[PDB]
Design a protein that fits this description.
Blueprint lengths: L4 E6 L4 E6 L4 E7 L3 E8 L7 E12 L2 E10 L3 E9 L7 E8 L2 E14 L5 E11 L9 E4 H10 L7 E12 L2 E8 L1
Parallel strand pairs: 7-10
Antiparallel strand pairs: 1-4, 2-3, 3-13, 4-12, 5-11, 5-13, 6-7, 6-12, 8-9, 9-10
Length: 185
């Protein structure tokens, strides 16, 4: 059940220094970026997975997300379970709330157009989100019971695709600086 996948993608703006550490550990130091997504997890996501992580350092200076991050195909959907962030809390079209792992999360949809996706092509895809209503404490072991999110999403007509691609616990940044260190299993 150990992680088997390393996500390290940057648009190339500014500095994004990602280290593929031991096992499920990684760290990122970044400055004057653009957009990047770095994380560890699994090549083939599951709706049934129980994700454990410990963010030993969560230190964005500006806009960054600490989030479950993954894709499906059939249909093409990028999804989030956002536990913490920096200066900016992400939002979208409000659907409702879900309680999971000691937190209340807002459920959102968004859409991207003319946008990079896993297929390597610029296209259009829907995004599903759970975003915690307040920041989750970091530095101790934390669980994301993903089934709870999948089920709440289903109740709001947000159905994931049949073809599961990667599924990681990520640091995502936007035009910011910061540091993170996260362990995933």
């Amino acid at each position: 059940a150990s992680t088997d996948y390393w996500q390290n993608a940057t648009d190339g703006g500014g500095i994004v220094n990602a280290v593929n550490g031991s096992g499920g550990n990684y760290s990122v130091n970044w400055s004057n970026t653009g957009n990047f997504v770095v994380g560890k997890g699994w090549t083939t996501g599951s709706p049934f997975r129980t994700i454990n992580y410990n963010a030993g350092v969560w230190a964005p200076n500006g806009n960054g997300y600490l989030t479950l991050y993954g894709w499906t195909r059939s249909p093409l959907i990028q999804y989030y379970v956002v536990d913490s962030w920096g200066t900016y809390r992400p939002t979208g079209t409000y659907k409702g709330t879900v309680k999971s792992d000691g937190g209340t999360y807002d459920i959102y949809t968004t859409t991207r157009y003319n946008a990079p996706s896993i297929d390597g092509d610029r296209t259009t895809f829907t995004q599903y989100w759970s975003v915690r209503q307040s920041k989750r404490p970091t530095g101790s072991n934390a669980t994301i019971t993903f089934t709870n999110h999948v089920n709440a999403w289903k109740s709001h007509g947000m159905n994931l695709g049949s073809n599961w691609a990667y599924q990681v616990m990520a640091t995502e940044g936007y035009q910011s600086s910061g540091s993170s260190n996260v362990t995933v299993w």
